[PDB]
Amino acid sequence: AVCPDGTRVSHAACCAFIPLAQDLQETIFQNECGEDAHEVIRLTFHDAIAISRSQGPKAGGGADGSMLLFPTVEPNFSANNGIDDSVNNLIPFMQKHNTISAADLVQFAGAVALSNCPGAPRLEFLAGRPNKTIAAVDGLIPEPQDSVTKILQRFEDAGGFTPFEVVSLLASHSVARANKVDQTIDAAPFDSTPFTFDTQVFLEVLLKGVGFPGSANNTGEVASPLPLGSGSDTGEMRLQSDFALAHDPRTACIWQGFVNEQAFMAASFRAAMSKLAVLGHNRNSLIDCSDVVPVPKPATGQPAMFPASTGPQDLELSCPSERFPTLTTQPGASQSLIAHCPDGSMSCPGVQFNGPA
Numbered sequence: 001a002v003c004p005d006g007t008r009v010s011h012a013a014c015c016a017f018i019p020l021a022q023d024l025q026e027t028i029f030q031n032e033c034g035e036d037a038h039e040v041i042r043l044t045f046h047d048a049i050a051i052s053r054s055q056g057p058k059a060g061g062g063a064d065g066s067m068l069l070f071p072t073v074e075p076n077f078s079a080n081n082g083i084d085d086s087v088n089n090l091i092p093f094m095q096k097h098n099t100i101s102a103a104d105l106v107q108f109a110g111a112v113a114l115s116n117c118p119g120a121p122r123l124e125f126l127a128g129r130p131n132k133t134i135a136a137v138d139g140l141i142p143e144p145q146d147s148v149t150k151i152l153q154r155f156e157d158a159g160g161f162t163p164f165e166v167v168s169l170l171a172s173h174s175v176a177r178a179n180k181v182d183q184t185i186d187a188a189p190f191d192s193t194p195f196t197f198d199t200q201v202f203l204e205v206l207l208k209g210v211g212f213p214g215s216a217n218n219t220g221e222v223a224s225p226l227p228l229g230s231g232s233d234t235g236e237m238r239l240q241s242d243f244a245l246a247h248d249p250r251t252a253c254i255w256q257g258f259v260n261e262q263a264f265m266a267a268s269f270r271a272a273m274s275k276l277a278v279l280g281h282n283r284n285s286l287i288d289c290s291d292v293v294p295v296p297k298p299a300t301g302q303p304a305m306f307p308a309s310t311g312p313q314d315l316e317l318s319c320p321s322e323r324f325p326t327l328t329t330q331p332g333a334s335q336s337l338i339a340h341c342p343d344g345s346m347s348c349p350g351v352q353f354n355g356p357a
């Protein structure tokens, strides 16, 4: 087909997503892998994972746009703390680009947000999900304090995800921060490069913890290897779940397998996301609109490296069957502060709309 802007697209139904991508970029992302982008990527997962094979259809419809359609229900469950901001930012687009369903909107927005992160893959995007569903039940969202067994069961019950696909999905923590785990601090990064879709998160979770970014008594949080922060540049935070998956016999070698393996990590993430994005639907009933997802920002191609103040001697390895790669260490006697803003500054508030959530 060919859209009203000369863009030759695969199917005419995909044309509507072009003006949406531009609107999302201009209004809330500003072509960067910042605050608003991170929040939308998180929403993609929270919307999709609320489904259960054992409990049946009444438990939730998966990637159905339920968070936007029933803003006063799910956003208020304990496990969805902080999701309100992304819901209120997306609702305005639902009302404007009214030919696109709330469900399609959520998945597409995530694909657009991710493309702003250097090193991220170009996600597959299928369209045609219904604009009608039910509000999901509480308890279907995994939490930081959950055990690996509980986490693995949840993903299996949601869509038959194997442990490999579960760890692959966690590559998203390479461009993630926390605002609710500790109420005394904001935007605590999970890795030293929160604006880069690289393999640092896999490396940094394997280092010995030496302190905490803020309080040391938070549910679902364990000691961090790079806790130093100053002003707006908050220190690195480490979640119990990420730590637990890095050391459990079932997932340890998978987790290590991604260290310094950029192409492998990105490809595996893309694959896992293809399954996640269609939970609650039959992919044979959705149109392929992948050619409408923006081309992702390229990375520099540099290898993973130990951040300043850490080295090979600080590793807590759990995979007995695989040799850990030889990586270099960045020079410096002390830990470098992790930048709060993608431009290096400490002042960069993302656009935020008020809404029902």
Ligand code: HEM
Residues within 6 Å of the ligand: 035, 038, 039, 041, 042, 045, 082, 142, 143, 144, 151, 169, 170, 172, 173, 175, 176, 177, 178, 179, 180, 181, 239, 241
């Ligand atoms: C075992 C599963 C997971 C657990 C327990 C988990 C837990 C968390 C927690 C506690 C936060 C901090 C939120 C806050 O306090 O502000 C977070 C943030 C985030 N997570 Fe996960 N996560 C999981 C899986 C995933 C997956 C599969 C995705 C998406 C593909 C994802 C994407 C994100 C992103 C992008 C953020 C950052 C939000 C921001 O920077 O504002 N997570 N996650």
Ligand SMILES: *[C@@H]1O[C@H](CO)[C@@H](O[C@@H]2O[C@H](CO)[C@@H](O)[C@H](O)[C@H]2NC(C)=O)[C@H](O)[C@H]1NC(C)=O
Residues within 6 Å of the ligand: 069, 091, 094, 095, 096, 098, 099, 100, 101, 102, 131
């Ligand atoms: C999907 O459902 C939503 C929720 O009912 C629809 O949203 C309304 O859209 C109109 C414009 O078309 C706005 O004036 C309303 O205010 C919206 N309602 C809310 C609560 O935001 C949306 O139009 C529907 N879209 C499709 C493609 O069916």
Ligand SMILES: [Ca+2]
Residues within 6 Å of the ligand: 046, 047, 048, 049, 050, 060, 061, 062, 063, 064, 065, 066, 067, 136
């Ligand atoms: Ca949902």
Ligand SMILES: [Ca+2]
Residues within 6 Å of the ligand: 173, 174, 175, 191, 192, 193, 194, 195, 196, 197, 198, 199, 200, 201
């Ligand atoms: Ca990163």
